[PDB]
Amino acid sequence: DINIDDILAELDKEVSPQQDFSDLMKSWKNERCSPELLPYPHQLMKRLLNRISMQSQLIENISMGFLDNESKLPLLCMETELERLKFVIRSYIRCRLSKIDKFSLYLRQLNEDENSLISLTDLLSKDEIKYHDTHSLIWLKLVNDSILKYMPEELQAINDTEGSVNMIDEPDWNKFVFIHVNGPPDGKWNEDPLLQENEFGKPCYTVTIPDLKEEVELTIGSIYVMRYEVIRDLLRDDKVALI
Amino acid sequence: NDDDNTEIIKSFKNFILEFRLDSQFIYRDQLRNNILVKNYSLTVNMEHLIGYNEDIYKKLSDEPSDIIPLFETAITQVAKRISILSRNSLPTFQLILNSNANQIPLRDLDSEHVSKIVRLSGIIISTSVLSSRATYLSIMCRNCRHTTSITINNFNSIVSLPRSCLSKNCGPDPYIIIHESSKFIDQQFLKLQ
Amino acid sequence: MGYYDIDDVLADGTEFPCKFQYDIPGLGYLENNPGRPITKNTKLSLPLWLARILAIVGVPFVELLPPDMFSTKVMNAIKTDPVALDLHSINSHFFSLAIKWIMLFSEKELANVVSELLLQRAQELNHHASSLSIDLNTNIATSTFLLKLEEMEKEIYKKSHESYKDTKRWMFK
Amino acid sequence: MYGDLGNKLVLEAKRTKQLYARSNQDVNLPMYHEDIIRNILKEVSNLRKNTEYLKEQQQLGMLDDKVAKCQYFVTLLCMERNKRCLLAYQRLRTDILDSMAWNNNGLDLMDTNNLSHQEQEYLKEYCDLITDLKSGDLVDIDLSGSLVPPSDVFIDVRVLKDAGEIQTEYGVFNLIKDSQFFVRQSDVERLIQQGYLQKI
Amino acid sequence: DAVFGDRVRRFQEFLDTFTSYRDSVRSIQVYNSNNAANSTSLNILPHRIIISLDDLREFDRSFWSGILVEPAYFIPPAEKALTDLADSMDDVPHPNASAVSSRHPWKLSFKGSFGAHALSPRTLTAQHLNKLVSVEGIVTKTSLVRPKLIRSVHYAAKTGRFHYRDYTDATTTLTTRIPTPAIYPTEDTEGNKLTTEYGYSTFIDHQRITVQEMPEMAPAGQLPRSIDVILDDDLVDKTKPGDRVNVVGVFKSLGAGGMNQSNSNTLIGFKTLILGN
Amino acid sequence: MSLPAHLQQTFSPEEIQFIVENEPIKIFPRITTRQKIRNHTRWQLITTDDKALNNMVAMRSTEVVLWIALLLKQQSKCSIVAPQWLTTKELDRKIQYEKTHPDRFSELPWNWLVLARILFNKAKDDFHDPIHELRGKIQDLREIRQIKVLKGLKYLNESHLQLDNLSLLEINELRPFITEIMDKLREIHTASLTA
Ligand SMILES: [Zn+2]
C-alpha cells in the first residue's frame, strides 16, 4: 500500500544546557586523543563558565536561606553535579595546557608566520595565550643562561629547523586514533554531501590514504582505527568522533 | 564406570567455571592467563576446593590416583572452552595442588598414608636428569598393520601394550610403538631427606 | 624522531662501520690521531648522528658499510623465529636504528622484514602483557621473554601491561 | 669522539626518566649532574676555540676550501650533538619539575638542593604562573585540583597526623588523630592530598 | 604413498631451483671418478650434501617447517630426491660389480639458522622429541667404530641368481619399521641353499658419541648434563673426546619404556638420543 | 607536565566509568517529588534535564541520568531497573551469536562492561535474574570477545582497522597497544616509501 508517513510528518511540523554539556564532553573526548591541538570553543566555554558561576551563586543563596521541608537531596545533587562539570573542564584545560607545552615552538612559528591560515587568537584561549607566552619565555631564559650562553650564535637558536635534526616538534599528523563514524550531525542523511551510499544499503563516507593510494569506506555507525591526518577533515565537521 | 567418570569430570569443570570469591572468577582467570603464556597447568588451592563442595574434596582425598586424571581432563575441557573458538591439539593440562594440611614427618609415612595425599617437608639431596614418559602412544600391529593409539594418564594405580591383535592371529604381543607419532612428557626423579 | 626524545638521542649515538672516500686533512680529533689527518679509503666506526650527515654531503666524504646488525645472518634469524630472537643483545635500539637505515637507504626489503618481525613479536608481547598474575592466598616464560626486548618494545609492553592492569584493578575493585 | 660525555649524560637522564616513572614515589630529581655539565660545556668551549683558531689560520694561511669547510663542518656537527644531549637532559628535568609543581601545588612547596639556581628560579616562577592561571578566568574551577573523576560525593576518612582544629566552609573539623569522619569528598580533598587524611 | 611422492617431487623442484647443490653433487661425482681413474690414494668424497635451511625456507616454507618440526616424514623424501638427482645426472660409467649391489644413498646435512631448535643438552626437554634440533657441547665419550649390517647379498649356487635382504634398526632409519633379527637367510623360498656374499653386502660404520653441555654454561649448583648422539657412515671418527662440537640431528626416542607387563608401576622412561646428521 | 604520563593519550578506567555514568537509565522511585495541586527545593541542574526529577512518583518508572540514579540508590530512595540486554535470556542469545559468528563481534551496547560492573556493585538486589548467573554470563561474553580480539590483533596492518561492535572499555584497554604498534608499522612503511 501507499505510505502515509509524509502527511503524518506534515501534521507534526507546526542552545540548551544539556547540549552545552554534551558538546563539552565531545570536545574533551576529541582533545584527549587527537595528536594536534584542536581549536578552542570560545563561545561554549564562555557559556559553561557563566553557568558554573550562576549555579554556584544559586547554591550559596539557597544555603543561606537554609541557614535560618528538610529536602537536601536537590542541594546534594546540585553540588555533586557542579563538581562533575568542574572536573570535566579541569581535565580539558589541563590536557590543552599539556599539548601547548609539547608543541610550544610549533605554535610560536605558526604565530610568527604571516602565510599561516590560523592564528593563536583563534586557536588558544586568553589564559592559554598568557600561559604559552610566559612558559616559553621562562624556559627560553633557563635554557639560554644554562646551555646556550656557552654556545656560538649559529648554534644559539631555540627553534633551529635547519640543523642536522629538526628541533621544532610537530604533531604526529598520521597518528592512529580510534574513530566512531557518527554520520552527519543532523538527523537527515541525504542533505549532507560526501555520503556516498555503499552497497548493502548502509551509507558510508569515503577517504583516501595518500601514502598507500588506497580508498576506504567509512560506514556509519562503525568503529575504525584510522590515521588522524585522513580523518581530520571529517572530525572538524563532527561527522566522526574520536573514541 | 563411564557415567561416574563423566559426573566427576562435569563436577570439577563446574568448580573451575563457577568458583569465585569476590567478583573475580579466580580459576577461569588463572587458566586463561596460564594459557596465554603457554603454561598448560592450573595451581588449584585446596581450601577453595573444600569450600566450594566438600564432596568433591572427599572424592579426591579418597582415591587421588583415580580422581586427579579426571580433574586434569576437566581442566583441559575448560581450557578448550575458554581459549578456542568453536567451529584443538591442546595438551592435557597438569593439576598442581596447594594444601595447608598438617605436615606429616618423613619418617611417619608408614603402611597407612599409602595412596593418600600427604604434605611433608624435607631437603632435596639429588635430582635426576629428565626422563621421557609417553602420554600419546601411537601403536601399530606387527602383522596386520592395525594402527591405533593409547593415551597414558601417568598416575600409576598401585598400563602396558595390549596382549591382543585387537583387530590372522598376529601372535600374543603384536604391537610395536611408532616413535615418530607418539607424544612424550619429561619426568624427573628427586630424593628427599 | 623527536628532538628531545632520549631514546632517539641514544639511538643516534651508535657507532657504525663506514669507509672514507677522501684523504681528508686535519680531522681525527678523537679518532686515534688528533693532529694527524685521516687517510683515504680508511674504514672507521662513527656515531650515526655523524655518519648520517657525512654520507650525504660532499662524492660523499664517508661511505656507509652494511652493519652487522642488518647482515644476512641476522636477517635469516629474523625470518626463521621472530619470537625467539634475543634482539636486546643484537642491539638495544634495534627498531629505531632499522627505521633510520630504511629512511636513509630506502631499503624496501629490509622494511618488509622488520615490519613482519615487529608484528610477530607484538603478538607475543601482547600475550605476555595481558596475562596478569592472580594470587590464590611472575611466570618463568614471561620473565625469560622480557629479557629479549629492545628499548622500544620494552615501552610498548609497559604501556599495554599498565593499561590491562588498570582495567583489571578497576573491574575487580 | 666528542659526544661521549653527552652520551653518558643522556644515559643518566634515561635513568632519571624510568627512575621517576616508577609508579608514584614522587621521587626528587637526582641532584643536578653539574660535573658532567661542566665537562661538556668545557668541551664545547674547546671546540669553539678550535673553530676560531682554524678560521684565523685559514685567513692568514693558504688553506683550500676542502679542509677549511670540512673541519669546521665536523666541529659544528659535534657541537650540535653536544647541544642536543644537554637540551634533552635539561628538558627532561624541566618536564619532571613541571609535573612536580602541578601535583604539589595542593600538596607541598619543597630537598631543594637537588636543583641548580636556574632550575630553582624556574620552579619558583612556575608556581606563580600556575597561581596566575588559577585566578585569571578559570577561578570557578580549581585548575590545580585532582584529575581523578569525582565518583562518590560522600566518603569516610581517617586522620593520620594530628592537626588540632581546622575551619571548613561552614562548620569545623576537629582533626583528632586516629578519628574517622564521614564527610563530603569536596571539602577534604586538599587535606587528603597533603597527607593528613587517609581513607579513599 | 601419494604424500611421499609429493615431497620427493617438491624437493626435486627445490634442488632444480638452487643449482648450487647440483653443482656440488657434480663436483663430488667428478672427484670420485677422477680418484677412481687415478697409487697410494684413499681420499674419496662422501655422498653427503649440506643444504642451507634458509634457502629451503625461502623456497617452500611448508617443506622447511616440515623438516624442522617432523623430519621423520620430510627427510627421507628429500634424501630420495637427492639420490634420484645424483643418479639421473650420474656419468653412467661401467659398473664395478659392487656399487650395483652396495647401496650408496645420498645422505643430507643441514646448516643455517634454527631459532628455537638451537639448543643445548641441558635445555633438550621431551617437547623436542622427533624434531630436528642442534645441540652444542663438549664430546666426552666416543664409542668404538663398529660396522653394522644394513643389507646382505646372497648367491644361490643352483639358479645363478642373487638374492638380497634389507635390514633396519631403530638407530638407522628415521621411520619406525619392524626390526629384523639380523639372521642371514640360509635357505631360499624354493628349498635352495644360499651362501652369503660378503663384499657385495652393505655394512656401515656406527659410532655413539656423548655430548655434554659446556661446564661454564651450567646453572649455578648443577653438574653438566649429557646427551648421546649416534653418528654413522661419513660422520664416524669426525669427533674425539674434548672437542667442542655442534651436532645437528633428529632427537629420537626408542623402546617400550615399561608398558611391557614386566613393568606395571615401574616408572622408568624411554631411551632418547640424537641421530646425528 | 600538567597531564600525567598515564593519562597522555588514553582514558583511565575511572574516566570511562565517569563517561558511562552520564547515560540515562530507568528507575523506580521510592520517593515522590511531584507537587500536589493543593516549601520544597527543585533540582534545577545545568548538565541534564531536571524535568523527570521534579515529577517523580513512587513506583512509577522514569528515566534519570545514571550518576543520579546511583546517588538515590545510595539510600533506599530508588530502584535501578536493569536494561533489557542485562537478562539471562538476552545474554544467552548474545553468547550464541558470538559462538555462531567467529569473525564479528555481537551487538552489545558500548557500555556493557562498565554498566554491568556498576549495577552489580551498587544495585545488586534489583535484578529479576540471579546475579550469580548474570556474572557468569558476563564473564563468558568477556572471554569470547577476548578470544576474538587476540585473533584480530593478528591483522595489525599500517592502513586501518575495523573493530566493529567493540565495546568502550575493551577499546580503551586495547588502545595503547594497537595505536602504538600500528604507528611503528606505519613509520616503517613511510621510511621505505621515501622515494
Ligand atoms: Zn594384527
Report CA-CA distances (Å) from D102 to A37, A90, B61, D127, F82: 21, 13, 60, 8, 41
- Count the domains in chain E: 3
The H or E element spanning position B137 is strand B131-141
Q: Do D116 and D175 sit in the same domain of this protein? A: no
- Count the domains in chain D: 2
Broken C–N links (> 2.5 Å) in chain B, after residues: 87, 158, 167
The grid cell for D116 is 641548580
Nearest CA in chain D to F16: D149
Say if A49 falls within a structural domain: yes
Q: Do A141 and A57 sit in the same domain of this protein? A: yes
State how far the Cα of B65 lies from the Cα of C150, in Å rounded to an integer: 47
Q: Residue F39's beta-bridge partner residues? A: none
Q: Do E4 and E56 sit in the same domain of this protein? A: yes
Q: Do A161 and A227 sit in the same domain of this protein? A: no
Length of chain E: 277
The grid cell for E25 is 653433487
Per CB-CB distance under 8 Å, the chain C contacts of E112 are: 76, 80
CB of A87 within 8 A of CB of A119? no
Closest CA of chain F from C151, distance in Å: 13
Q: Does F171 touch chain C (CB under 8 A)?
A: no
Helix axes E19-37, E71-88, angle to 10 degrees: 60
How many beta carbons lie within 10 A of that of residue D57, not counting itself? Answer: 11
| CATH code for the domain in which residue C119 is found | 1.20.58.2050
Sign of the Cα torsion A151, A154, A157, A160 reads: negative
Q: Do E182 and E131 sit in the same domain of this protein? A: no
Per CB-CB distance under 8 Å, the chain D contacts of A146 are: 90, 116, 118
Burial of E228 (0-12, 13-18, 19+ CB in 10 A): middle
Residue D176 sits at the vertex; the CA angle it makes with D172 and D177, to the nearest 5 degrees, is 145
Q: Do E178 and E49 sit in the same domain of this protein? A: no
B vs C, Cβ pairs < 8 A, gives 34
State how far the Cα of B8 lies from the Cα of B14, in Å rounded to an integer: 10
Say if A2 falls within a structural domain: no
State how far the Cα of B15 lies from the Cα of B95, in Å rounded to an integer: 14
Q: Do E28 and E106 sit in the same domain of this protein? A: yes
Q: Do D114 and D172 sit in the same domain of this protein? A: no
Four-point Cα dihedral A137, A139, A143, A145, nearest 10 = 60
Q: Do E92 and E196 sit in the same domain of this protein? A: no
The grid cell for B85 is 573458538
CB of E63 within 8 A of CB of E14? yes
Nearest CA in chain F to B83: F147
CB of A231 within 8 A of CB of A173? no
Report CA-CA distances (Å) from E180 to A216, E149, E189, F40: 67, 11, 18, 104
Residue C71 sits at the vertex; the CA angle it makes with C69 and C77, to the nearest 5 degrees, is 85
Question: b vs e for A139-150, b when ≥16 Cβ sit within 10 Å of the residue's Cβ?
Answer: bbebbeebbbeb
Q: Which of B93, B87, B121 is nearest to B105 (CA)?
A: B121
Q: Which of residues 86-115 of E touch C (CB under 8 A)?
A: 112-115
Q: Do D176 and D90 sit in the same domain of this protein? A: no
Structural domain of residue E93, as residue ranges?
1-117
CB of D3 within 8 A of CB of D77? no
Say if A23 falls within a structural domain: yes
Q: Which of residues 71-110 of B touch F (CB under 8 A)?
A: 82-87
Interchain proximity B28–F148, CB inside 8 Å? no
Interchain proximity B129–E73, CB inside 8 Å? no
Per CB-CB distance under 8 Å, the chain C contacts of F187 are: 99
Q: Do A37 and A154 sit in the same domain of this protein? A: yes
Q: Do E199 and E209 sit in the same domain of this protein? A: no
Say if A103 falls within a structural domain: yes
Q: Do A134 and A193 sit in the same domain of this protein? A: no
Q: Which of C131, C134, C171 sits opposite B26 (nearest CB)?
A: C134
Say if A8 falls within a structural domain: no
Q: Which of D117, C48, C55, D55 is nearest to A152 (CA)?
A: D55
Sequential DSSP letters for D45-92: HHHHHHHHHHHHHHHHTT--HHHHHHHHHHHHHHHHHHHHHHHHHHHH
Interchain proximity E258–B160, CB inside 8 Å? yes
| Sequence letter at residue A192 | D
Helix axes C108-129, C94-105, angle to 10 degrees: 160
How many beta carbons lie within 10 A of that of residue C111, not counting itself? Answer: 24
Closest CA of chain D from F34, distance in Å: 25
Dihedrals φ, ψ of F2, to 5°? Answer: -65, -40
State how far the Cα of F116 lies from the Cα of F122, in Å rounded to an integer: 10
Q: Which of residues 10-49 of B touch C (CB under 8 A)?
A: 23-24, 26, 29-30, 32-34, 36-39, 43, 45, 48
CB of D129 within 8 A of CB of A141? no
Exposure on the CB side of residue A123, measured as CA atoms within 13 A: 17
Per CB-CB distance under 8 Å, the chain F contacts of A32 are: 9, 11
Q: Are E and D touching by the rule of 3+ CB pairs within 8 Å?
A: no
3-state secondary structure of A42: helix
As a whole number of angstroms, the longest Cα–Cα distance in chain D is: 88
Q: Does F111 touch chain C (CB under 8 A)?
A: no
3-state secondary structure of E80: helix
Q: Do D184 and D127 sit in the same domain of this protein? A: no
State how far the Cα of B41 lies from the Cα of B31, in Å rounded to an integer: 8
Which residue out of A48, A104, A142 would a mutagenesis test of the D interface target, given it has the greatest number of D Cβ atoms within 10 Å? A142
Query: In terms of C-beta distances under 8 Å and separation of at least 24 residues, what long-range contacts does E251-256 make, across chains too?
Result: E251/E124, E251/E128, E251/E129, E251/E130, E251/E131, E251/E132, E251/E133, E252/B179, E252/E129, E252/E130, E252/E170, E252/E174, E253/B132, E253/B179, E253/B182, E253/B184, E253/E129, E253/E130, E254/B179, E254/E170, E254/E171, E255/B177, E256/B161, E256/B177
- Count the domains in chain A: 2
Sign of the Cα torsion E130, E131, E132, E137 reads: negative
Length of chain B: 193
Q: Do E237 and E255 sit in the same domain of this protein? A: yes
Q: Does F1 touch chain A (CB under 8 A)?
A: yes
Interchain proximity C3–A165, CB inside 8 Å? yes
CA C25 remoteness from chain centre: 33
State how far the Cα of F181 lies from the Cα of F175, in Å rounded to an integer: 10
Q: Do D119 and D29 sit in the same domain of this protein? A: yes
Q: Tell me, what DSSP letter sits at residue E123?
A: T
State how far the Cα of A140 lies from the Cα of A151, in Å rounded to an integer: 14
Structural domain of residue C86, as residue ranges?
3-173
State how far the Cα of D120 lies from the Cα of D113, in Å rounded to an integer: 9
State how far the Cα of E173 lies from the Cα of B156, in Å rounded to an integer: 33
Structural domain of residue A194, as residue ranges?
170-242
CB contact set of E231 (below 8 Å; sequence gap of 6+): E207, E208, E209, E238, E239, E276
State how far the Cα of D73 lies from the Cα of D71, in Å rounded to an integer: 5
Per CB-CB distance under 8 Å, the chain F contacts of C111 are: 188-189, 191-192
DSSP alpha helix (H) spans, E167-206: none
C vs D, Cβ pairs < 8 A, gives 65
Q: Which of F191, A237, A8, F144 is nearest to C1 (CA)?
A: F191
Rg (alpha carbons) of chain D, rounded to whole number: 26
Q: Do D141 and D155 sit in the same domain of this protein? A: no
Residue D136 sits at the vertex; the CA angle it makes with A113 and D128, to the nearest 5 degrees, is 90
Sign of the Cα torsion C52, C53, C56, C62 reads: negative
CB of F65 within 8 A of CB of F22? yes
Q: Which of E188, E219, E206 is nearest to E121 (CA)?
A: E219
Dihedrals φ, ψ of C140, to 5°? Answer: -65, -45
Q: Which of C16, C107, C31 is nearest to C65 (CA)?
A: C16
Q: Do A99 and A189 sit in the same domain of this protein? A: no
DSSP alpha helix (H) spans, A34-168: 42-66, 73-102, 104-112, 126-146
Structural domain of residue D99, as residue ranges?
1-146
Q: Do E111 and E21 sit in the same domain of this protein? A: yes
Closest CA of chain C from B34, distance in Å: 7
Q: Which of A147, A169, A191 is the last residue of a domain?
A: A169
State how far the Cα of C95 lies from the Cα of C87, in Å rounded to an integer: 9
Q: Which of D131, D146, D161 is the last residue of a domain?
A: D146
Q: Which of D150, F62, F72, D87 is nearest to A72 (CA)?
A: F72
DSSP alpha helix (H) spans, chain B: 2-18, 26-36, 46-52, 54-62, 64-83
Q: Residue F27's beta-bridge partner residues? A: F62, F80
Per CB-CB distance under 8 Å, the chain B contacts of E255 are: 177
Q: Do D23 and D76 sit in the same domain of this protein? A: yes
- Count the domains in chain C: 1
Which residue out of D26, D104, D148, D200 would a mutagenesis test of the F interface target, given it has the greatest number of F Cβ atoms within 10 Å? D148
State how far the Cα of D122 lies from the Cα of D116, in Å rounded to an integer: 10
A vs F, Cβ pairs < 8 A, gives 117
Q: Do A98 and A208 sit in the same domain of this protein? A: no
Would strands B175-177 and B41-45 be described as parallel, antiparallel, or unpaired? unpaired
| Sequence letter at residue B97 | L
| Sequence letter at residue F9 | Q
Interchain proximity A74–F19, CB inside 8 Å? no
Q: Do D54 and D9 sit in the same domain of this protein? A: yes
Which residue out of C7, C16, C29, C92 would a mutagenesis test of the D interface target, given it has the greatest number of D Cβ atoms within 10 Å? C29
Q: Do A128 and A225 sit in the same domain of this protein? A: no
CB of F46 within 8 A of CB of A58? no
Distance B176 CA to ligand 1 centre (A): 11
Q: Does B18 touch chain F (CB under 8 A)?
A: yes
List residues of D whose CB lies inside 8 A of any F CB.
Answer: 21, 95, 98-99, 102-103, 147-149, 151, 153-154
Per CB-CB distance under 8 Å, the chain A contacts of D150 are: 80, 83-84, 87
Say if A5 falls within a structural domain: no
CA A167 remoteness from chain centre: 26
Q: Which of A126, A142, A169 is the last residue of a domain?
A: A169
Q: Do D167 and D137 sit in the same domain of this protein? A: no
Per CB-CB distance under 8 Å, the chain A contacts of C49 are: 164-165
Per CB-CB distance under 8 Å, the chain A contacts of D136 are: 126-127, 130
CB of A186 within 8 A of CB of A192? yes
DSSP alpha helix (H) spans, B37-164: 46-52, 54-62, 64-83
CB of D107 within 8 A of CB of D194? yes
State how far the Cα of E129 lies from the Cα of B138, in Å rounded to an integer: 14
State how far the Cα of A239 lies from the Cα of D12, in Å rounded to an integer: 47
Q: Do D128 and D164 sit in the same domain of this protein? A: no
